[PDB]
């Protein structure tokens, strides 16, 4: 039926999902990287996000 997904998801954390683990909560949207915080911690070493201070 055509009313399976009637309710919108055009705002809120209904839209925003992580690009790695499909997280909805904790999604840091900044810079348009769309991954959750722990995924960012894990993948910073390999992407090139380096801790200096």
């Amino acid at each position: 039926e055509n009313v399976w997904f009637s309710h919108p998801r055009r705002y809120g954390k209904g839209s925003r999902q992580c690009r790695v683990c499909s997280s909805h909560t904790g999604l840091i949207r900044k810079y348009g990287l769309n991954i959750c915080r722990q995924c960012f911690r894990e993948k910073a070493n390999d992407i090139g996000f380096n801790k200096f201070r």
Binding site: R19, L33, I35, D46, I47, G48
Partner: protein, 111 residues
């Protein structure tokens, strides 16, 4: 066209995606590392790996599939994306390669 900050962040996230894909499947093919060569209308991506002759596939079919995946994903004309495969001396200088080697050894059942 779009902002440089978001542009290079997407560069990083695509690098992470490709590294995850490579370490997920090309691991048993002795995958060690990658580096992206950016050229006008060309994306060269290099791979120094241990099991090059078996990652290659019979007449480059697996390399063709790896290429044409991202080609069709980003509507590239065929040949614009190109990935090159080499073998580095001193294979012990690859922590990821050693990691996957003993990772497979565990599922094999060695002590």
């Amino acid at each position: 066209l779009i902002s440089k900050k978001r542009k290079l962040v997407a560069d990083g996230v695509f690098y992470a995606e490709l590294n995850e894909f490579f370490t997920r499947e090309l691991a048993e093919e002795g995958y060690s590392g990658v580096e992206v060569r950016v050229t006008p209308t060309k994306t060269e991506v290099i791979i120094r790996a241990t099991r090059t002759q078996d990652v290659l596939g019979e007449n480059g079919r697996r390399i063709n599939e790896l290429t044409l995946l991202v080609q069709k994903r980003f509507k590239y004309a065929p040949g614009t994306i190109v990935l090159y495969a080499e073998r580095v001396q001193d294979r012990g200088l690859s922590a990821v390669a050693q990691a996957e080697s003993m990772k497979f050894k565990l599922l094999n059942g060695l002590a």
